């Protein structure tokens, strides 16, 4: 047995499992299946840990899974003092993707919602700390005012709402879902199902 | 999109990942790759948690993975007071397999080694507690004597040694390895490697 050619096959299968788990994480996120998302995320992290080295494509995949995990935990709320949406905002800006009108839309919605979710939980000191971390040198003039006067139900927040953020993210998720829908593992699995029907 | 036919495909792929991870756990166990075994075991447990229901074949697979994890931790040495080899002995007796001459050989070696590893760590009280749990109503007359006189280097233990146990287990592992070597995921992965060479 050639240990090298066996490890090479294990690496090909690890990459195949990663793409399938990303696709399952995207669908669970879109479908609102919380427990399924939690279980699939655990499987993806374990598969990723087995891989010693990742390609640029695989890095993009794991970063999407990490971004979705953070968005899923936004209203919850580890190793750092930053909030889950602030953490999603760092991932979002570092994913190797085109910075189109949808990228900026999601980015500003996450920035706004990182503050709004603190205010809605009654954490006004945290909203102030999140604000200074996100804006420390376009909407800063308005947000500082809203946070200062503790106006949780300002009309600005009703336009840039959690649902508005969640819909823009869910439409980004649908593009990733169409791109990876043709990956090896899911395509081979769907073929088996159709053979039984 | 038919949510039912998507979940069906996800279940087919989960079963495919389980067989591949079992095969990778068997090879890592046989190869002495401790860290690889640890990482693959973590991946297998996460995949198993995603599956709501398992077939008899899949139950046999997870039980082999659990048995190997326990054997790997035998000289270490959670939720119970039983030792890892005592736990391997419960799995061994409940795996749906033929009780051949190799089954009884592995069983008696595990029974003997569950006591011997306690004595070798200087845990003579634990060796006595393990003995009464394993024998509480063939070698009991001899083992009680060896444990009573704290004879860690008795010739009985040199015949039924950790290596003797480990070799019989490694030859069982090789039969499982030949049986699952033809599973979908590993066979498809190996085909890709040969296409590149
Ligand atoms: C490394 N990694 C991969 C993933 C996954 F989302 F599953 F893709 N998640 C993590 C880590 C990132 C830091 C916090 N803990 C989890
Ligand atoms: C359920 N399960 C599956 C496996 C695996 F070995 F990965 F196959 N291990 C467990 C559990 C068994 C009880 C102790 N903790 C781990």
């Amino acid at each position: 047995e050639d240990a090298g050619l066996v490890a090479e096959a294990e690496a090909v299968a690890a990459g195949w499992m990663l793409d399938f788990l990303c696709l399952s994480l995207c669908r669970a996120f879109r479908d609102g299946r919380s427990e399924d998302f939690r279980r699939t995320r655990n499987s993806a992290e374990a598969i990723i840990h087995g891989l010693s080295s990742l390609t640029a494509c695989q890095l993009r995949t794991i970063y999407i899974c990490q971004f979705l995990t953070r968005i899923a935990a936004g209203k919850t709320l580890n190793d750092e003092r930053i909030t889950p949406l602030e953490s999603a905002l760092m991932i979002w800006g570092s994913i190797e993707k085109e910075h189109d009108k949808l990228h900026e839309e999601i980015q500003n919605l996450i920035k706004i919602q990182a503050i709004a979710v603190c205010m809605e939980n009654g954490n006004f000191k945290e909203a102030e700390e999140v604000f200074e971390r996100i804006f420390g040198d376009p909407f800063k003039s308005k947000l500082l005012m809203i946070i200062s006067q503790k106006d949780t139900f300002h009309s600005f927040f009703q336009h840039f709402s959690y649902n508005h953020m969640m819909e823009k993210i869910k439409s980004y998720v649908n593009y990733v879902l169409s791109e990876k829908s043709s990956t090896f593992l899911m395509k081979a699995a769907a073929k088996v199902v159709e053979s039984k029907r």
Side-chain angles (χ1 to χ4, degrees), chain A residues 1-50 52-74 76-77 80 83-97 99-100 102-103 105-107 109-124 126-133 135-136 138-139 141 145 147 150-157 159-166 168-174 176-177 180 182-186 188-190 192-193 195:
Chain A
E1 184 183 292
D2 191 287
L5 299 185
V6 168
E8 290 191 70
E10 288 189 17
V12 167
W16 279 340
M17 289 188 282
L18 173 57
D19 273 345
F20 167 82
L21 290 163
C22 173
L23 201 58
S24 182
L25 204 69
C26 288
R27 282 182 170 113
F29 180 91
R30 176 203 62 185
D31 291 359
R33 299 183 272 113
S34 295
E35 289 300 292
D36 281 355
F37 186 95
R38 184 189 50 90
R39 290 180 203 110
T40 296
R41 193 223 65 84
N42 282 355
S43 298
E45 196 192 317
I47 294 306
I48 296 166
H49 280 312
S52 65
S53 179
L54 312 187
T55 70
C57 183
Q58 287 170 327
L59 276 179
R60 180 211 165 218
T61 297
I62 84 154
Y63 292 158
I64 296 170
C65 302
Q66 288 183 46
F67 173 77
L68 297 187
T69 299
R70 255 71 184 91
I71 294 298
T76 315
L77 300 123
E80 43 185 357
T83 64
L85 291 179
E86 281 180 278
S87 170
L89 190 77
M90 304 186 228
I91 309 177
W92 192 243
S94 319
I95 288 170
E96 200 104 331
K97 57 178 301 298
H99 283 43
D100 56 1
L102 183 58
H103 178 95
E105 270 165 6
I106 290 164
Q107 178 180 41
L109 278 161
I110 295 167
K111 279 195 191 158
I112 290 158
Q113 279 306 295
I115 284 163
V117 305
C118 287
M119 295 187 72
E120 289 175 51
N121 288 86
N123 302 340
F124 297 107
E126 209 170 332
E128 293 176 7
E129 297 164 344
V130 168
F131 172 87
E132 305 282 343
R133 286 191 300 258
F135 310 91
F139 302 116
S141 58
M145 168 203 67
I147 302 164
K150 333 286 198 55
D151 200 346
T152 304
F153 305 144
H154 198 286
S155 54
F156 179 78
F157 288 150
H159 186 285
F160 301 109
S161 69
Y162 206 72
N163 280 10
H164 188 17
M165 177 197 76
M166 213 46 74
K168 294 283 182 182
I169 292 162
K170 278 185 184 182
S171 87
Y172 166 65
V173 167
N174 280 4
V176 177
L177 215 41
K180 293 188 198 289
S182 72
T183 50
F184 177 74
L185 204 53
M186 189 61 169
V192 170
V193 178
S195 80

